[PDB]
């Protein structure tokens, strides 16, 4: 799916955004031992 101003995004990156509900990237924590997904 595309990124949907009316079709804007987090703006800026999720590291310093203020709208986590609309930002597709969700901050997660590693569990019992895995790799950083992104």
């Amino acid at each position: 799916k595309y990124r949907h101003w009316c079709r804007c995004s987090c703006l800026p990156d999720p590291i310093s955004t203020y709208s986590p509900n609309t930002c597709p990237q969700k901050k997660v924590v590693v569990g019992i031992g895995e790799h950083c997904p992104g």
Binding site: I32, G33, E34, H35, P37
Partner: protein, 97 residues
Amino acid sequence: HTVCKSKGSIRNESWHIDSSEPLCLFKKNFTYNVSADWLYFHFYQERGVFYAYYADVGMPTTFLFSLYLGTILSHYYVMPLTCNAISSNTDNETLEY
């Protein structure tokens, strides 16, 4: 999609196209009872390790192998088997999964 050997169709089995051998983590063959009526499989993941069970005779299952991936599997899919042996005009046989 895939095609069955006996009474093949006009298509060819084509689900992946690789010019060279890609990186693999597990490649092993297994043998099962060909005269079995039903087969059962237990597939699941835990702590980044993929476990698999299989059984040819009887309802209870037995351990087959385990594989480490380090990632989290998300989706699964069953591709259609298209050939001229599972038709209605031929012998009455259907695919079940």
